[PDB]
Ligand binder design. Structure first.
Ligand SMILES: [Ca+2]
Ligand SMILES: [Mg+2]
Length: 142
């Protein structure tokens, strides 16, 4: 299956509430239709995914809401082994050389130039429709 190398039983950490039933766990439930949707502005707030174990990750796929509140245009992504010290591994924030994402609901892929040993990912929304984060799926690949 195409997702054989996506870690199972990822856990999430979000401290600022959800909209309706769109809970943080729905960003990593393997269902492209279900989503996390923040209750309020997610700008500069960390959405953390704990893979439970360190893996050498080769790429990320992110899937956001299509054309509505929470569709992400720009974000920074950080990685950590210990959950304290994070290093930036991706940015399409203003000033970077990477274009903002279209709000088209299609998979956004980040292919790492070399695999990175990581346990935790932190996603920091920098620009999004309505300032929310609405993330249908986050998939790191071993
Ligand atoms: Ca989902
Ligand atoms: Mg690997």
């Amino acid at each position: 299956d195409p997702y054989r190398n996506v870690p199972k039983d990822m856990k999430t950490e979000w401290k600022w509430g959800q909209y309706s039933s769109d809970e943080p766990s729905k960003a990593v439930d393997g269902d492209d239709s279900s989503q996390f949707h923040s209750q309020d502005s997610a700008i500069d707030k960390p959405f953390i995914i704990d893979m439970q174990k360190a893996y050498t990750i080769e790429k990320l796929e992110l899937l956001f809401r299509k054309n509505g509140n929470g569709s992400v245009k720009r974000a920074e992504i950080y990685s950590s082994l210990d959950g304290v010290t994070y290093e930036k591994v991706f940015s399409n924030a203003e000033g970077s050389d990477i274009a903002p994402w279209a709000t088209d609901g299609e998979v956004k892929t980040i292919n790492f130039n070399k695999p990175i040993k990581v346990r935790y990912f932190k996603i920091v929304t920098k620009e999004s429709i309505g300032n929310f984060l609405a993330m249908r799926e986050f998939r790191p690949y071993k």
